[PDB]
Structure 1
Amino acid sequence: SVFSERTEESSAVQYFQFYGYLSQQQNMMQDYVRTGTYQRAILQNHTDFKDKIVLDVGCGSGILSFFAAQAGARKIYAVEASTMAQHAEVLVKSNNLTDRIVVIPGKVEEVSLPEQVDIIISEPMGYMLFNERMLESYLHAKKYLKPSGNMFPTIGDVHLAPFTDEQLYMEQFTKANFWYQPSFHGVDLSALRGAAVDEYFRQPVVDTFDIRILMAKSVKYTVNFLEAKEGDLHRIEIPFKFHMLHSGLVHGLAFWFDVAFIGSIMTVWLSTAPTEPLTHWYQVRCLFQSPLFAKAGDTLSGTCLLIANKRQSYDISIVAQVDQTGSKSSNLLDLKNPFFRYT
């Protein structure tokens, strides 16, 4: 199948074991911004669901399908690949909705639906939007979408912005300098100090921050789920040209994302921006190996290249340069293993 070919078996096992936990579902469900906004987006666009055929990609507990049922849906196919599918089925029965919601255990790339659907709903967003590579499942599912069919969410915007955070940058060296001692119990650890620094900088940092560390207006990269193909997400090139609003040292790039539910009645936005109330996605920061000095008015140009890997994530390549000075910095990061810094 399409899923197995793009996914290492070891990664897939871990991945679906993770979502097999009721606590993990619960964690997502208790993210009120997320869950509430989904329910709002569905109910406020009830004309998009009333007596419609619905597909829920990766239903988990089945909560979105229930929201679709609340909106008056006729039939909802709730596809789930982890063992959570059995718990979703129990909920369908206990909520007396067996006539409207059909839980289909398995990967959306492998299961079969009896009919085409009017609208696809899903929550496939990971860290930096693209983590977990579930957007491709979401896009793959369009084989079951009627022409003129709709997608909830419909589009996704990932935002990038340069930031200054001296403490975050110095923190890495403070942690790596553990190895920079000549006699740890009689052992000289110094030779590994470089490797330690390297390791720390490969980890994207997950947490939140004050918006005042941002030094330029964000650059936006948009995915239209109605138009995109899964293969479009294998190689994501995000060019940027930041016009610096403040003078100072750029320590790296901050990432966040919005999704839009473009319905017939209204468009509802779900945002994980640092200007908005915190979600379980927080924000993500990728550090530069060497900070870049910029004057207000200077331009910071370059590219953020996301390359999909078989561990259900992306290898991040970031190249940036201050055009006025030619001062350049790059970093390679491993999105699969972020550092959860939030406290």
Structure 2
Amino acid sequence: SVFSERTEESSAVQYFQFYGYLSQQQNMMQDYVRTGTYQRAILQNHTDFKDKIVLDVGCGSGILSFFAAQAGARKIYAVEASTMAQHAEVLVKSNNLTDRIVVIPGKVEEVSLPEQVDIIISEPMGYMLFNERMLESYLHAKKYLKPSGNMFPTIGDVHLAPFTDEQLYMEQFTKANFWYQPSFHGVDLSALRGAAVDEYFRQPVVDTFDIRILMAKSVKYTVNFLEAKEGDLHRIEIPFKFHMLHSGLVHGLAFWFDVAFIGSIMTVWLSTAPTEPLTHWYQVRCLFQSPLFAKAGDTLSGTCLLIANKRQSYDISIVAQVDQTGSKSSNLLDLKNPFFRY
């Protein structure tokens, strides 16, 4: 299938094993912004579910299918590839909804559905939106979507902005400088310093931060899920031109995302911005190995390039430049191995 065609088997095993655990499900359900926002988007747009056929892609514990049933769906097919599917079936029986919610075990790329659906619901967003590469499964599920069917979420906005954070930079730099040691128990480690710094600087930093560290207004990059094809997510190129509002050192770029549920009654937004209550997606910063100095009024321009890999993640290229001085920075980051600083 398309899933095994883009996924190393060891990565898939670890991934689905991880999501089979009830403790993980408990952790995600306790993100109240996330669960309450999903419920609000589905229930306040009840007309998009009343007597309709719905597909829930990666239903996990099944919570979104319960929301869809509460809003009046006639039938919901809930597709889930991990052993969580078994737990989801247990809940469907204990809540007396077997006439409404049909759990289908398997990958959405591999299963067979009996009919086309009026609406697709899912929670396919990983860190930085794109990590885990579940957006591609979500878009693949459009083969089951009737013409003029809807998607929940409907669109995704990624935000990027340059930041300054000397304490974060020094934390990572001093960790790497352990390898500057010429006599660690009598041994010279310093030939590996460059390797160690590379290793540490490829790790995107998952945590939250004050918005005072941002040095420019965010640039926005939009994926419309009603219109994107899976192959659009293999290579994601985000050009950027920042107009610097503060002078100082740019230590890297900060990423967050909002998704929008564009319903017939209202549009509901779920935001992981640092100006909004905290979610289990936090925010993500990519550090430059060498920061760039900039003056207020300067322009920081460049490209953020995401290349999908077979470990369900992305290789990140950030190339950036201060136009007024020609100072340049090039960075390669490994989204699969984040540093959870929370």
Smaller-chain TM-score range?
Answer: over 0.9
Shift of 1:232: 0.2
The match for 1:141 is 141
Q: Deviations over 1:200-219 (max 9, x none)?
A: 00000000001000000001
3-state DSSP of counterpart to 2:60: coil
3-state DSSP of counterpart to 1:186: coil
How far apart, in 1, do the equivalents of 2:186 and 2:309 lie?
41
How far apart, in 2, do the equivalents of 1:22 and 1:124 lie?
19
Q: Deviations over 1:257-287 (max 9, x none)?
A: 0000000000000000000010000000001
The match for 1:181 is 181
How far apart, in 2, do the equivalents of 1:233 and 1:221 lie?
13
Shift of 1:182: 1.9
Shift of 1:189: 1.4
How far apart, in 1, do the equivalents of 2:248 and 2:242 lie?
14
Q: Deviations over 1:284-327 (max 9, x none)?
A: 00011211111111100000000000100000000000001110
Q: Which runs of 5+ in 2 are unaligned?
A: none
3-state DSSP of counterpart to 1:28: helix
3-state DSSP of counterpart to 1:132: coil
Shift of 1:168: 1.0
The match for 1:120 is 120
Shift of 1:60: 0.0
How far apart, in 2, do the equivalents of 1:178 and 1:309 lie?
30
Shift of 1:193: 1.5
3-state DSSP of counterpart to 1:3: helix
How far apart, in 1, do the equivalents of 2:165 and 2:71 lie?
45
TM-score by length of 1: 0.99
Q: Deviations over 1:166-199 (max 9, x none)?
A: 1111212211121222221111111111111110
Q: Which moved more, 1:180-189 or 1:92-101?
A: 180-189
The match for 1:292 is 292
Shift of 1:81: 0.2
The match for 1:154 is 154
How far apart, in 1, do the equivalents of 2:335 and 2:269 lie?
25
How far apart, in 2, do the equivalents of 1:51 and 1:197 lie?
56
3-state DSSP of counterpart to 1:179: helix
TM-score by length of 2: 0.99
How far apart, in 2, do the equivalents of 1:177 and 1:7 lie?
35
Please tell me whether residue 320 in structure 1 is matched to residue 328 in structure 2.
no
Q: Which moved more, 1:233-242 or 1:185-194?
A: 185-194
How far apart, in 2, do the equivalents of 1:182 and 1:301 lie?
39
Q: Deviations over 1:13-72 (max 9, x none)?
A: 000001000111111111000000000000000000010000000000000000000001
Q: Which moved more, 1:174-183 or 1:20-29?
A: 174-183
Q: Which moved more, 1:227-236 or 1:171-180?
A: 171-180
How far apart, in 1, do the equivalents of 2:302 and 2:180 lie?
33
How far apart, in 1, do the equivalents of 2:169 and 2:331 lie?
13
Q: Which runs of 5+ in 1 are unaligned?
A: none
How far apart, in 1, do the equivalents of 2:264 and 2:213 lie?
38
3-state DSSP of counterpart to 1:197: helix
The match for 1:77 is 77
Q: What is the aligned-residue identity percentage?
A: 100
Q: Which moved more, 1:185-194 or 1:148-157?
A: 185-194
Shift of 1:110: 0.3
Aligned residues: 342
4+ long deviations beyond 2 Å: none
The match for 2:338 is 338
How far apart, in 2, do the equivalents of 1:199 and 1:130 lie?
21
The match for 2:3 is 3
How far apart, in 2, do the equivalents of 1:156 and 1:325 lie?
34
3-state DSSP of counterpart to 2:115: coil
3-state DSSP of counterpart to 1:136: helix
How far apart, in 2, do the equivalents of 1:274 and 1:48 lie?
31
Q: Deviations over 1:137-158 (max 9, x none)?
A: 0000001000000000000001
Shift of 1:222: 0.5
The match for 2:61 is 61
How far apart, in 2, do the equivalents of 1:189 and 1:299 lie?
40
Q: Deviations over 1:219-257 (max 9, x none)?
A: 111010000000000000000000001111101000000
How far apart, in 2, do the equivalents of 1:250 and 1:209 lie?
15
Q: Deviations over 1:70-117 (max 9, x none)?
A: 001000000000000000000000000000000000000000110000
